[PDB]
């Protein structure tokens, strides 16, 4: 449960947290071991995991449809924004290995700073997919949300955006 | 209950028309008052048929619940709440001895329910900065009462507590609660706000001078409840600023600018701009009251022309009993204020050459 979940939050869904196309990682079962209402907590938490599979898919297919070098740079940045979300799932398991009483709510608390970076980067990604922003206008949809106002996602999209400028400062440095 | 809603608004209007530079003076949402659970206060075996020493354990359990304000199975908090005096109803069929001891233990519950009600109703913005801190420092003692009853619950869990031992353990906090509840009754009854609820905390602190069980309580309460007023006065004496968002401070600022704005015919800055209030003087400072108005009124008119005025050393001022050191602090600020303005007017705005050339 606390290892199945600390892996389901990662890529690997498992039997408890069944994946589905319409909606991802919704455990839907009546379990004696879990408390009846913990599924609701788990649903709120699985929003984060579901998002993680969605970004991982998106980085997989890149790096007719969407194509370019900028989709090979935005995704590389989207790896780096997710790196402290991988390390912060390793650390949870390290603590849970030793402490035998610690419950799900510590997972909730520890992975609550990642319920602001992720939901508002997901709108950026769905924008980039629903509207074929393939070329240089990707910088637009990153810089238009980088103004933001929510500081976790204002610095996240900044890390994403600077890489795109890193590409644009070699495309427009070869030219000049 | 319903009758307080008027009082809050009637106070709010006075502050609104008094002060228009600071706009949209805050209010709390309606549910903050409507919801009854947010505030502190709101299968039964027939007790007749049991043995005695089990009735004792039962009533002890119910009273340990009552101490935090929540009802008990065998003892109920009467919902009347008329005037302010809370009353309780013990079960009719009990042993006379236990019933009387329950009555003798019950006054701390009536002196907790009123104490929490005071903290909720007099923590809305309208009642003023001082009446806020009085409730905000009464609230710490409410927390510590909760600490105590938690320890009593642990002891009762171990079957090692009885009503007679409860009687002893609740004596030190009974005095605390009685002082807080009578003080709250007086503060609410007098409709005292600002410095009227800083005079009453001085007089009740004289009231007990040798007790020293309630004197430390009252001295601590007034130390904490005078942080607002003194922060207003501390700014007023060392700066020309009167925030005083609500009409609480003894000095008040009338908006006589609407009439006097060119020649200032009224000499309003020194006639009727900054004027005094009588009922809102703390009454430890009546001896210095006029001098304070003069003190800060001299600071305004150098704060008005942009020349930065700051005391050489700003001394923070704390409530004190038996020792009038605030007096010499007001004088130490007053003499520097007089130097400040007379010098400012005689070097900037330099009055002697104006008078000559007139």
């Amino acid at each position: 449960m606390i290892h199945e979940l600390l892996l389901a939050l990662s890529g690997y869904p498992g039997s408890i947290f069944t994946w589905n196309k319409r909606s991802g990682l919704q455990v839907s079962q009546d379990f004696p071991f879990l408390h009846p209402s913990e599924t609701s907590v788990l649903n709120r938490l699985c929003r984060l995991g579901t998002d993680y599979i969605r970004f991982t898919e998106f980085i997989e297919q890149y790096t007719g449809g969407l194509h370019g070098i900028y989709l090979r740079a935005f995704c590389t940045g989207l790896d780096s924004v997710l790196q402290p979300y991988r390390q912060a799932l390793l650390d949870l398991e390290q603590e849970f290995l030793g402490d035998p009483h610690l419950s799900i709510s510590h997972v909730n608390y520890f992975l609550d700073q990642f319920q602001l970076l992720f939901p508002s980067v997901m709108v950026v990604v769905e924008q980039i997919k629903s509207q074929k922003i393939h070329g240089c206008q990707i910088l637009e949809t990153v810089y238009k949300h980088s103004c933001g106002g929510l500081p976790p996602v204002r610095s996240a999209l900044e890390k994403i955006l600077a890489v795109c400028h890193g590409v644009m400062y070699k495309q427009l440095s070869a030219w000049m | 209950l319903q009758q307080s809603l008027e009082l809050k608004r009637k106070m709010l209007r006075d502050k609104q028309n008094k002060k228009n530079s600071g706009q949209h003076l805050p209010i709390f949402p309606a549910w903050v008052y409507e919801r009854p659970a947010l505030i502190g206060d709101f299968t039964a075996l027939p007790i007749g048929t049991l043995p005695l020493a089990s009735q004792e354990s039962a009533v002890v359990e119910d009273l340990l619940y009552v101490l935090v304000g929540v009802d008990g199975r065998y003892v109920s908090a009467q919902p009347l709440a008329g005037r302010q005096s809370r009353t309780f109803l013990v079960d009719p069929n009990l042993d006379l001895s236990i019933r009387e001891l329950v009555h003798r233990i019950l006054p701390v519950a009536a002196s907790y329910s009123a104490v929490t009600r005071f903290i909720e109703e007099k923590s809305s913005f309208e009642y003023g900065q001082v009446n806020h801190a009085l409730a905000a420092a009464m609230r710490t003692l409410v927390k510590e009462h909760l600490i105590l009853v938690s320890q009593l619950e642990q002891l009762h869990r171990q079957g090692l507590l009885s009503l007679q031992k409860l009687w002893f353990y609740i004596q030190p906090a009974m005095r605390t609660m009685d002082i807080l509840a009578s003080l709250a009754t007086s503060v609410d009854k007098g409709e005292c706000l600002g410095g009227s609820t800083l005079s009453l905390l001085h007089d009740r602190s004289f009231s007990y001078t040798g007790d020293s069980q309630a004197q430390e309580l009252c001295l601590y309460l007034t130390k904490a409840a005078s942080a607002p007023y003194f922060e207003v006065l501390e700014k007023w004496i060392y700066r020309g600023i009167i925030h005083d968002p609500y009409s609480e401070f003894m000095v008040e600022e009338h908006e006589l600018r609407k009439e006097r704005i060119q020649e200032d015919y009224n000499d309003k800055y020194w006639d009727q701009r900054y004027t005094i209030v009588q009922q809102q003087i703390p009454s430890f400072l009546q001896k210095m009251a006029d001098k304070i108005l003069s003190t800060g009124k001299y600071l305004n008119v150098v704060r008005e022309c942009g020349h930065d005025v700051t005391c050489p050393v700003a001394k923070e001022i704390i409530y004190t009993l038996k020792e009038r050191a605030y007096v010499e602090q007001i004088e130490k600020a007053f003499n520097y204020a007089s130097k400040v303005l007379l010098d400012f007017l005689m070097e900037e705005k330099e009055l002697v050459a104006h008078l000559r050339s007139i």
């Binding site: 449960m1 290892h3 199945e4 890529g11 690997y12 498992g14 379990f31 004696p32 035998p100 | -």
Partner: protein
């Protein structure tokens, strides 16, 4: 106990159900298997290869891991 994930099959027993035999390898042994596979090695009991297609062995279970998530991660290593 949270170190024995899916060892309790009470959910499955809620309906009548037959348990399937599984090897019950240790999680520590699994990393050793992955490491020799990622280096040049063949014929490992985990990750059985059949036609030059390395594929996760059909039945492996561990204490603090459910069958499905273990299959998912092991397949993800086997792809590499």
């Amino acid at each position: 106990n949270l170190a024995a994930v899916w060892d309790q099959h009470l959910y499955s027993s809620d309906p009548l159900y037959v348990p399937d035999d599984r090897v019950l390898v240790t999680e520590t042994q699994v990393i050793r298997e992955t490491l020799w596979l990622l280096s040049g090695v063949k014929k490992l009991f985990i990750f059985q290869l059949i036609d030059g297609k390395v594929t996760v062995r059909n039945n492996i279970i561990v204490t603090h891991l459910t069958h499905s998530c273990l299959r998912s991660v092991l397949e993800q290593i086997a792809a590499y």
